[PDB]
């Protein structure tokens, strides 16, 4: 009959990171209206392929991140450990996928200098990518912490809140992908 | 009974209150003559391993027999060396705690009274109690 403090304090904090992407969307939408006479990518072209497959991986990561956190509530430490290696390797496929999208757009197109679009594309998808790399570090710091105690309910409740951060990263990237690829 | 503002809590901690201008402890000596009396007591009870305690109160009964009841209120009445002063009566009296008898209290306690009676007359009370505890602790050794 108690409201689970450490699961409260994350969602109070995960409301702050949405405001971190309120000052990163506002850089995009004001470099789109007051600067875009034509379409905002003038010398660059965004391929939906290599962008629509890597965003179906984060959708299928938050499925596997939630099917691992169901094994935390039951008590399976090994059910938690299996699906957070499925979630970790698929999140690492996203950073390796999104990192290859940058190489396709730097040595062929625009970078952070040179274009006003390349400075709002590489910061909106840049500080999101640091929230994925910082989210994959929490899948190392949680699975290496299941190896040190008897998998208490405090070991499971910290697996709730690392899952809450990964659903937030997935939801923000839906809000990115459906803005900087489909509302071009 | 209880005073006007105190209240008895769930356990026996009497939680007191004081009106916003007035103080909490009304010791009638100046503040820099209580600080000098602490490190007379605290360093006197540290160098000599006794416990020096100072009593200032009315000994309305017989003087030599009332101060044994004061000695039991010290938290360890074995190493306790109590100095009782009656400012109404000229009734300074040292009460050792029946364990410092082996060490040197018998050559210090008549020296602890005369060095605190010469500082009461033509003087105030806190001059003597400072100049007793730092005198009768040099005579006491662990």
């Amino acid at each position: 009959n108690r409201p689970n403090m450490v699961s409260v304090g994350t969602i109070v904090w995960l409301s702050s990171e949405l405001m971190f992407f309120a000052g990163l969307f506002a850089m995009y939408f004001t470099a789109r209206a007051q600067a875009g006479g034509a379409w905002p990518p003038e010398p660059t072209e965004l391929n939906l392929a290599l962008a629509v497959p890597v965003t179906l991986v984060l959708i299928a990561s938050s499925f596997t991140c939630q099917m691992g956190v169901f094994a935390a509530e039951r008590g399976d430490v090994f059910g938690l450990r299996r699906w957070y290696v499925i979630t970790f390797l698929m999140g690492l496929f996203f950073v390796l996928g999104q990192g290859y999208e940058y190489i396709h757009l730097v040595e062929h197109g625009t970078t952070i200098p040179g274009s006003a679009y390349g400075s709002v594309f590489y910061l909106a998808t840049g500080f999101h990518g640091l929230h994925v790399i910082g989210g994959l570090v929490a899948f190392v710091l949680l699975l290496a912490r299941t190896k040190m105690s008897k998998f208490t309910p405090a070991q499971a409740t910290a697996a709730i809140v690392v899952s809450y951060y990964w659903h937030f990263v997935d939801i923000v990237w839906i809000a990115l992908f459906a803005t900087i690829y489909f509302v071009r | 009974d209880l005073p006007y503002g105190s209240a008895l809590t769930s356990s026996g901690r009497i939680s007191a209150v004081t009106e916003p201008g007035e103080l909490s402890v009304h010791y009638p000596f100046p503040t820099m003559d209580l600080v000098v009396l602490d490190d007379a007591l605290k360093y006197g009870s540290r160098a000599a391993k006794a416990r020096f305690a100072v009593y200032i109160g009315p000994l309305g009964a017989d003087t030599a027999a009332t101060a044994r009841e004061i000695l039991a209120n010290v938290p360890t009445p074995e190493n306790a060396v109590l100095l009782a002063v009656s400012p109404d009566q000229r009734a300074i009296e040292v009460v050792y705690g029946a364990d410092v008898k082996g060490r040197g209290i018998e050559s210090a306690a008549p020296l602890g009274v005369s060095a605190a009676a010469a500082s009461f007359k033509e003087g105030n009370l806190i001059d003597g109690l400072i100049s007793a505890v730092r005198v009768m602790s040099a005579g006491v050794s662990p």
Partner: protein, 550 residues
Amino acid sequence: LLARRPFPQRLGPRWTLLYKLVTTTDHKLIGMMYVVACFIFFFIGGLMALLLRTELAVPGLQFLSNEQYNQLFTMHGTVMLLFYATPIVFGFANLVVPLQIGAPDVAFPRLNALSFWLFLFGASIALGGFLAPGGPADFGWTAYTPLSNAMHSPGAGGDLWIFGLIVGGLGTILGAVNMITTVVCMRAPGMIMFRMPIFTWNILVTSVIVLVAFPLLTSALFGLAADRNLGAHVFDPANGGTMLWEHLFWFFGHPEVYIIALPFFGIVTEIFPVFSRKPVFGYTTLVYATISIGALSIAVWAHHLYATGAVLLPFFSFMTFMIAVPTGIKFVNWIGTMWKGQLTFETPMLFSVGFLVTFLLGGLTGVILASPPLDFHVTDSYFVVAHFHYVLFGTIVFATYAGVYFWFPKMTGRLLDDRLGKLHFWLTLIGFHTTFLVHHWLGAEGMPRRYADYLPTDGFTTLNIVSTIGSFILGVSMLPFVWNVFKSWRYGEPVTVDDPWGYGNSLEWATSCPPPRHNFTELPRIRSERPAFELHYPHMIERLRAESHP
């Protein structure tokens, strides 16, 4: 009978504190570290104001350079707002909020300590820009982006200013996670969301506003560092940009302004029923005034943008006049709770009456500046610099010292002195109305802010000297307050009494001074808005419920 040591121990032993400052999660100690390590910055920021006031005394560049001046009010506005005024919010929160609810600690104790040290290292990075050859941030504390480029402000030091406000800007976000989830989760059994003091509501509401303001700043400053260290056309003036920053700074800017004001309304609501012997008048209405300020503060960001071309002026006009209504409700609840009670002017009460006198002129000139044609004359003048000291030196000086003098014999167990504390008040309110009252006249006649020299053909000399006469009275006034604390930290009148101010009205006055390491040896039966007035006074419980509601 009842053997006690004569005077309490002045300092501790040798080294009872130095490792207790490194490994601590005690919120009462972290609050005393916020309070001490912000008056370091109230002096570093303050000595810059006395160097920014002697150049303006005699009309000419007397001893400073021109660019040495412009990096003074920059590091005076930054240090006095973001390095003093925002952590003293979470100083009085860590001392008091886990006491005012029946809680042992804050929700996350190692984020309480980590929020202190992100401040103390985030602050000395930004004012560590004085070591640089070009000096620290030459632009304003607002840092408008054509001026904040890599070629208009080329030196580093303006780069440490950006990364001094994201380290400490992360400190307040992690400090506001504690102050919500302590209030939400850790109340006493019997304490409900109401019957909880107004100061805990103010720390609750502004912790919501910290999570709205401070991420939007941190997101804007990382876009300003990509504009400088990398080459990025965010904030570039041909892309929006020079009004992107105007809508990103001030969306942080006025919500951070109201997390400076509202928690020290809570100190002020705490003090008036203690010294006027009767409750907080309109208790629930002050709760619905704090919320409606905290909602309307976020939607008024562009009343700081009236002169810069085109914003939607009638939107941010009317929404800005709507903060005058709840802030005006909080005054009539403050005279109302001061009204019929007998009134003792002790030093916490004395500083809260000086709060009500200075903040009134700070709010009267605020709605003056809210109307845009009245703002079209004075919007970057010294009428503004008068405005945010009558509104700011009231909540952050007259209402922190109201709170320092009110919870000093609860944090240390020593009464801070009152004859020396009345000397410290009357040096301030005599001094403060000498300094900034003439800026209303001098700023409305043509003296714009952020100037170093003002040309003796102008008629500004005989009023800039009146402020400089007054400003050193504010510099002298710190001397009988530092001497008050330094003497009464270790000496000074002991409090063997769990409530030194008589009528405590909160759970912090139902415990010892100082409290134990987990704040409570007992808890009273919490069944009203004020527990320690129904405790300590059982002969009033049949009168709190009856003789209310006129």
